Amino acid sequence: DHYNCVSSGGQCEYSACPIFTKIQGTCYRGKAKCCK
């Protein structure tokens, strides 16, 4: 979720993860990806 994604160094993103990161979990009631 948003809290855990931010706490663990990820970024919540609605669209493709920024370069050199990838999906690992979700944010925003499941509508976004946690990119790490």
From Swiss-Prot:
Keywords, ordered alphabetically: Antibiotic, Antimicrobial, Defensin, Disulfide bond, Membrane, Secreted, Signal
GO biological process, one term: immune response
A GO MF label: identical protein binding
Protein location: Secreted; Membrane
GO CC annotation terms, alphabetical: extracellular exosome; extracellular region; extracellular space; Golgi lumen; membrane; microvesicle; sperm midpiece
Tissue expression notes: Blood plasma. Sperm. Highly expressed in the lower head and midpiece of sperm. Significantly reduced levels found in the sperms of asthenozoospermia and leukocytospermia patients (at protein level).
Disulfide-linked positions: C5-C34, C12-C27, C17-C35
Keyword Signal set for record: yes
Protein purpose: Has bactericidal activity. May act as a ligand for C-C chemokine receptor CCR6. Positively regulates the sperm motility and bactericidal activity in a CCR6-dependent manner. Binds to CCR6 and triggers Ca2+ mobilization in the sperm which is important for its motility.
Subunit text: Monomer. Homodimer.
Homology family: Belongs to the beta-defensin family.
Protein name: Beta-defensin 1
Included stretch of the parent chain: 33 to 68 of 68
